[PDB]
Design a protein around this ligand. Structure first.
Ligand SMILES: CN[C@@H]1CCc2c(ccc(O)c2O)[C@H]1O
Lengths: 323, 270, 313, 44
């Protein structure tokens, strides 16, 4: 019965343990430190009367989109701090948002268990196949946007048809965040089961399902190279090629809120509910410096494709876009 | 050389009067507490106290210490008007925050409805405008005519009729409004406390309200009482008792007010 | 060319004007989350506060038959098979179900239904009698603004309950708990509701939110109290040590039922006053139409109890 | 029941060397480190 599954789990654990050839810290030792780099709020995207729970960059590296706690969705020009469009959401609560690389449409999730894609140039279509609140979205293509739901079942959509092309299921706990790789041939998802499984684009099979973290996995982001990714304060990093824990990431006691790497990957912009995002070295595994401009807990972060600067969307209604 | 020590004490008082409002104003400007009607009103009162301490206090201190007034009357009347305006602004803001709190308690379903950033700006502007200090400069309404004419002296010998109405419109109506509003607040808090006490098993607010009421009371009542007395009764009041008591007491009020005025994080931020 | 800058400035001005117009209503509206226990009558309070009827009756009767099939799992034979086989739905079955409800097995299942789950026996008799008056009554957002204040009720309805952690600015969280469902599966339903209330009150995110716990179905609780089939002592041992509270305001009226109701309220209030958030209990039945008025008085007693705590007396 | 299937699927993986993966990641961070903004051309 379950003894066979337990034996398989033990064999997987043993293979992973023996796979450990050397410690990452050994390589980190020779790595020269990044240095204390203090970000500055060269702009202040403010003027949004809610606890902004969404913060997604645009592929053009010019515009960002945020979702209200009351239902107002506003697109922002980071250069002019002028809100280009403000389309309110039919559902009062929005739990996530995403900007399509084509830019023709902007994705806006919600807690109404229905995902609606808005047409920048009204709602183009509504997706409601999944069950429970839309955990996260990231428009992979102009017709394929990946959703995420509290039903422990992430799904792929065809925007034109408005039906779930495929299905992904198997996670014990509710999935709370998903991220897509630049290669677009794979993605990852962090669930409440303290586990992460890198699903396939079409097959729907977990390439390397890891469960290193202790508490629920709030968020996960891809490394720029696409060969690795990363409620407890610790935010571990895993190398998909080795399926192990690349490095374990001490006085911090708050909860991890969002994760985002840098263009060179050295900086791992991590924001907490302690109101001060802590930026840690990805290779040297050291805490270099922090930033803090807002008051309420941080909701989401992000980095532009050009990598010029970063955004910090908190619940304090102020999206201080640090530079 | 006791005058030297008295002047040192006065200098310390002036420095405290400046700092006790400058710190609050700087914290309000640097932090995100702004746009709140209560925070905006507190900042306005602190600005009034800062202006009063910066302008009126040192000139009056120099007048007390050195008998001669080394400057001219054209700016001396400006000093008198500025002092009148600052005292009026402090009292008016102390009453305005009371009115805001009273409406917040008595109608929470309209507390956020009535208050607004534009409404707060209008209220603050009206309070500052409420003329009573510009009239003495223009109308010259501010028997020892030599001091009003000579250059050495500056003694406040004004109309008995002007003094009564000025003191009334500056303090009496604010006093009645503050007392009534705060008594209503105390009654509402007592009723809420009893309603909570309806829970079986398992009054500091009285002291909390009493501190902020008594500060204004014991800092302002005697000076205006003496003002009315000297307007009515001429030979009863000595000059030195009037001066010491009036100036210093009302002025100390601004510092006491900053202290009476969340802010700890802003204060600790610097 | 500065035309682009001028156009963007005009658009930003229009958007800011619209946002300023909306902010008045956005702040004016008061929001409440009606987090209620499953099958605790949360609909009944919502129905009172505010084609499918026949469909509901068929749904309930099938659920009643589903309970009857589950009644077989616990502890006219062909008629029972007819409904159970036709239980799934995308005349003869109707009559077979009516007969099965008339069968003594239905009476036995209704009598021993603590372990069983039901929506409903009054409607089941009514369905057998069979819409009728009050038969249907016996994120679903709600916008029922009082003539004085704008009140909007939000329904969530999730073991992890991160949906709770999502909300942090509701004026109050309605926690409808059915007092009667205490004999009704390792732990009793009342104890599970108490655990849920403890979790909500002791929530890190929901630090500054009060709960208005309306003890629903108090009439059913009193009725079950009138019979001594299952004393509260057997379910809750501490009941025997408990005695009547010093303060009591009985309606018109049963000392035993009064003791039971006050015990339940005190049990809730202990966890409520453990640790701010102020719990406002009530004793309500479905017929009581003053629910909206009580909620309004509680809400007016929230902000007043909040501003005084907001760095004041 | 499907957990056995998932474990069997995860059984067959061509695991890469941890040391080699670490070195590759270090080199990848070194190569991209030049153009890492995190003032003349910076939009700010
Ligand atoms: C010399 N000090 C002045 C004298 C008269 C005066 C004061 C304050 C408020 C008034 O309405 C006054 O008429 C005092 O600050």
């Amino acid at each position: 019965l379950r003894q066979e599954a337990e034996q398989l789990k033990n064999q997987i654990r043993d293979a992973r343990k023996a796979c450990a050839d050397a410690t990452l810290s050994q390589i980190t030792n020779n790595i020269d430190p990044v240095g204390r780099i203090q970000m500055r709020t060269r702009r202040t995207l403010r003027g949004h009367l809610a606890k902004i729970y969404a913060m997604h960059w645009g592929t053009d590296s010019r515009l960002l989109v945020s979702a209200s706690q009351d239902g107002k969705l506003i697109i922002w020009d980071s250069y002019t701090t002028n809100k280009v469009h403000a389309i309110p959401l039919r559902s009062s609560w929005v739990m996530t948002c995403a900007y399509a690389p084509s830019g023709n449409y902007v994705a806006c999730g919600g807690l109404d268990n229905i995902c609606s894609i808005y047409n920048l140039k009204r709602v183009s279509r509504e997706l409601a196949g999944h069950t429970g609140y839309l955990s996260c979205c990231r428009f992979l293509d102009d017709n394929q946007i990946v959703t995420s739901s509290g039903d422990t079942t992430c799904a792929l959509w065809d925007i034109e048809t408005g039906q779930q092309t495929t299905t992904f299921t198997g996670h014990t706990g509710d999935v709370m965040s998903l991220s897509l790789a630049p290669d677009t041939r794979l993605f990852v998802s962090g669930a409440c089961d303290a586990s992460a499984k890198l699903w396939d684009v079409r097959e729907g099979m977990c390439r390397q399902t890891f469960t290193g973290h202790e508490s629920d996995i709030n968020a996960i982001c891809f490394f720029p190279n696409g060969n690795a990714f990363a409620d407890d304060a610790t935010c571990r990093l895993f190398d998909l090629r080795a399926d192990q824990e690349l490095m374990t990431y001490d006085n911090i006691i708050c909860g991890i809120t969002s994760v985002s790497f840098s263009k060179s990957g050295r900086l791992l912009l991590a924001g907490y509910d302690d109101f001060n995002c802590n930026v840690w070295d990805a290779l040297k595994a050291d805490r270099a410096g922090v930033l803090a401009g807002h008051d309420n807990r941080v909701s989401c972060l992000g980095v532009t494709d050009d990598g010029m600067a970063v955004a910090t969307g908190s619940w304090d209604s102020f999206l201080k876009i640090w530079n | 050389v006791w005058v030297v020590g008295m002047g040192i004490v006065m200098s310390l008082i002036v420095l405290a009067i400046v700092f006790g409002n400058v710190l609050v104003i700087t914290a309000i400007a640097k932090f995100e507490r702004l746009q709140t009607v209560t925070n905006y009103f507190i900042t306005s009162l602190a600005c009034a106290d800062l202006v009063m301490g910066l302008a009126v206090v040192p000139f009056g201190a120099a007048h007390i210490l050195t008998k001669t007034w080394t400057f001219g009357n054209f700016w001396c009347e400006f000093w008198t008007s500025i002092d009148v305006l600052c005292v009026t602004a402090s009292i008016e803001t102390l009453c305005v925050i009371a009115v805001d709190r009273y409406f917040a308690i008595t109608s929470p379903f309209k507390y956020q409805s009535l208050l607004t950033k534009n409404k707060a700006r209008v209220i603050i502007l009206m309070v500052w405008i409420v003329l009573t200090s510009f009239l003495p400069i223009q109308m010259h309404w501010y028997e020892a005519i030599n001091c009003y004419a000579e250059e050495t002296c500056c003694d406040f010998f004004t109309n008995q009729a002007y003094a009564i109405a000025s003191s009334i419109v500056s303090f009496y109506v604010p006093l009645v409004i503050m007392v009534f509003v705060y008594s209503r607040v105390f009654q509402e808090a007592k009723r809420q406390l009893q309603k909570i006490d309806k829970s079986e098993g398992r009054h500091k607010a009285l002291k909390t309200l009493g501190i902020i009421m008594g500060t204004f009371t014991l800092c302002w009542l005697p000076f205006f009482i003496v003002n009315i007395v000297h307007v009515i009764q001429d030979n009863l009041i000595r000059k030195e008792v009037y001066i010491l008591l009036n100036w210093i007491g009302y002025v100390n009020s601004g510092f006491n007010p900053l202290i009476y005025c969340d802010f700890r994080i802003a204060f600790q931020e610097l | 060319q500065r035309n682009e800058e001028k156009a963007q400035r005009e658009a930003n001005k229009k958007i800011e004007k619209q946002l300023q117009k909306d902010k008045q209503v956005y702040r004016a509206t008061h929001r409440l989350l009606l987090l209620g226990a499953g099958e605790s009558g949360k609909s009944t309070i919502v129905k009172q506060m505010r084609t499918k009827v026949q469909d509901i009756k068929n749904n309930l009767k099938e659920a009643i038959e589903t309970i009857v099939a589950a009644m077989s799992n616990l502890v006219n034979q062909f008629r029972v098979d007819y409904i159970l086989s036709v239980m799934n739905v995308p005349p003869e079955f109707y009559e077979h179900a009516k007969a099965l409800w008339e069968d003594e097995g239905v009476r036995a299942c209704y009598e021993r239904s603590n372990e069983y789950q039901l929506i409903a026996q009054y409607f089941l008799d009514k369905i057998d009698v069979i819409p009728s008056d009050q038969d249907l009554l016996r994120i679903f957002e709600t916008k029922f603004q009082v003539d004085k204040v704008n009140f909007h009720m939000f329904d969530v309805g999730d073991e992890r309950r991160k949906w709770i952690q999502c909300f942090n600015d509701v004026t109050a969280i309605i926690f409808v708990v059915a007092s009667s469902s205490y004999n009704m599966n390792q732990t009793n339903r009342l104890q599970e509701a108490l655990n849920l209330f403890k979790s909500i009150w002791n929530n890190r995110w929901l630090r500054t939110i009060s709960v208005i716990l309306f003890l629903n179905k108090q009439d059913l609780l009193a009725e079950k109290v009138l019979a001594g089939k299952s004393k509260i002592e057997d379910y809750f041992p501490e009941f025997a040590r408990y005695t009547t509270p010093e303060d009591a305001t009985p309606e018109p009226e049963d000392p035993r039922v009064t003791r039971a109701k006050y015990f339940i309220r005190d049990e809730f209030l202990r966890i409520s006053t453990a640790s701010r958030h102020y719990c406002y209990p009530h004793f309500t039945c479905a017929v009581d139409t003053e629910n909206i008025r009580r909620v309004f008085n509680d809400c007016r007693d929230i902000i007043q109890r909040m501003h005084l705590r907001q760095y004041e007396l | 029941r499907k957990l056995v299937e998932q474990l069997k699927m995860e059984a067959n993986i061509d695991r890469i060397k941890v040391s080699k993966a670490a070195a590759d990641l270090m080199a990848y961070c070194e190569a991209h480190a030049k153009e890492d903004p995190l003032a003349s051309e910076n939009p700010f």
